[PDB]
Design a protein around this ligand. Structure first.
Ligand SMILES: COc1ccc(C2=NN(C3CCN(C(=O)CN4C(=O)CCC4=O)CC3)C(=O)[C@@H]3CC=CC[C@H]23)cc1OC
Ligand SMILES: [Mg+2]
Ligand SMILES: [Zn+2]
Length: 333
C-alpha cells in the first residue's frame, strides 16, 4: 500500500462544505456531490468532519493526519460502479452517525464501539466490483472457488475484511494505533464481525439473534454490545428507504443500474439471471422499492425499534411515508 501524500490531504481539507449539516438526518449527499467539481474530495471531507466532530478519534489517540490518511486509503480502494462506490460507504458512515447521535443508540455502546462503527462503515464494501456474492458462486469464479474451498460463502465480505486489515497494518493509516491489548483486539474483532454480518444471506439469523438478546435482561453484555454493532451497520446498509423521498429514489436508481449491469454480465456468461437484475423486465422502480420495504426494511426497522432502539422511530415513520409516496406513483400512472 502506498502512502497518502500531503497534496492528497490538502484537497480534502480545502473543502469547506458551506450550508451542509453533516449530522442531520435530512442531509443530502447527492446535493453535496453536485455542489462541486470534485465530488470525491467532498465525500472524504464529510467522512473526515463526521469523525472529528464525534470527539472519538482524539480520545483513542488517532491523530488528525492518520484519520485522514485512513479515509483516503479507503477511497483508493472503491471502484467507479453505480451504487457500491465511495459515496455508498460515506452515506453508511453519515447514517450510522445519525442513528448513534440523533437516535441515541450511542447510549447502548461504549465510545470505542461508537468509534469502531463509524470507521467500519468506511471499510465495509472495500473493492466491490458491482457484483453480488451469488454471481461469483454461479460463475465458478476464482474468487468464488476459494470461498467454497475454504468454507465461507460470504465471498465479498471476507474480501472487504482482508483489505481493511491491509490499510490498518501501516501505522500511518491505522486509526486504531492508539490501542493495545484487549481494546485493539476488540476493535479489529468487532469491525470484522460487523462486516461479515452485512451478508444479506445471514440477514434473518442476525436479526433473530439481536432480537433474542434484546429481550433477555440476562443476555451476555459483550454479546449484546456486539450484536447491536452488527445491527447498526446492517441498518446503515439498508437505510436508503429511510431517507427523504428524492434521496431514497436516487439510491434506488443507482442500485437498479448496478444490478442491471450484473444481469447483462450473467446473460453473456449463460448463468441464471433473476428478475430484479434483468433489463428486459424493466420492472417499475415503485414496485421494486415497495417489495423491498415490505419484505426487508419495514419489518427490520420496526422490530429493532420496538425491541430496544426507540430513538430510531423516525426511520419507521419515513419508510411509511416513502411507501405511501411510491403507492401514489402507481395510483397516478
Ligand atoms: C435502494 O434500494 C436498494 C438498496 C440496496 C439493496 C440490497 N439488496 N440486497 C438484497 C437483494 C435481494 N433481496 C431481496 O430480493 C428481498 N426482497 C424480497 O424478498 C421481495 C422484494 C425484495 O426486495 C434481499 C436484499 C443486497 O444484498 C444488497 C447488498 C447489501 C445490502 C442491501 C443491498 C436493495 C435495494 O432495493 C431493491
Ligand atoms: Mg456489502
Ligand atoms: Zn454496503
Amino acid at each position: 500500500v502506498t502512502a497518502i501524500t500531503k497534496v492528497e490531504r490538502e484537497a480534502v481539507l480545502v473543502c469547506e462544505l458551506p450550508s451542509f449539516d453533516v449530522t442531520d438526518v435530512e442531509f443530502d449527499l447527492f446535493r453535496a456531490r453536485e455542489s462541486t467539481d470534485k465530488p470525491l474530495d467532498v465525500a472524504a471531507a464529510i467522512a473526515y468532519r463526521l469523525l472529528l466532530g464525534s470527539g472519538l478519534p482524539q480520545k483513542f489517540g488517532c491523530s488528525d493526519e492518520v484519520l485522514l490518511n485512513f479515509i483516503l486509503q479507503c477511497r483508493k480502494k472503491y471502484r467507479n460502479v453505480p451504487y457500491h462506490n465511495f459515496y455508498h460507504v460515506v452515506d453508511v458512515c453519515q447514517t450510522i452517525h445519525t442513528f448513534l447521535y440523533r437516535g441515541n443508540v450511542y447510549e447502548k455502546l461504549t465510545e470505542l464501539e461508537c468509534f469502531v462503527l463509524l470507521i467500519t462503515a468506511l471499510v465495509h464494501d472495500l473493492d466491490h466490483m458491482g457484483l453480488n456474492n451469488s454471481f461469483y458462486l454461479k460463475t465458478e469464479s476464482p474468487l468464488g472457488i476459494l470461498s467454497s474451498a475454504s468454507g465461507n460463502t460470504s465471498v465479498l465480505e471476507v474480501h472487504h475484511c482482508n483489505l481493511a486489515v491491509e490499510i490498518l497494518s501501516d501505522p500511518e493509516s491505522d486509526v486504531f494505533d492508539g490501542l493495545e491489548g484487549a481494546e485493539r483486539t476488540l476493535a479489529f474483532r468487532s469491525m470484522i464481525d460487523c462486516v461479515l454480518a452485512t451478508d444479506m444471506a445471514k440477514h434473518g439469523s442476525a436479526l433473530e439473534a439481536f432480537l433474542a438478546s434484546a429481550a433477555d435482561q440476562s443476555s451476555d453484555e459483550a454479546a449484546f454490545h456486539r450484536m447491536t454493532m452488527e445491527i447498526i451497520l446492517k441498518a446503515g446498509d439498508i437505510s436508503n428507504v429511510t431517507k427523504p423521498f428524492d434521496i431514497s429514489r436516487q439510491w434506488a436508481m443507482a442500485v437498479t443500474e448496478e444490478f442491471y449491469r450484473q444481469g447483462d454480465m450473467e446473460k453473456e456468461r449463460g448463468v441464471e439471471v433473476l428478475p430484479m437484475f434483468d433489463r428486459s423486465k424493466n420492472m417499475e422502480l415503485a414496485k421494486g422499492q415497495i417489495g423491498f420495504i415490505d419484505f426487508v426494511a419495514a419489518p427490520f426497522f420496526q422490530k429493532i425499534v420496538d425491541a430496544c432502539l426507540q430513538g430510531m422511530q423516525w426511520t419507521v415513520d419515513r419508510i411509511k411515508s416513502n411507501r405511501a409516496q411510491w403507492e401514489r406513483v402507481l395510483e397516478t400512472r
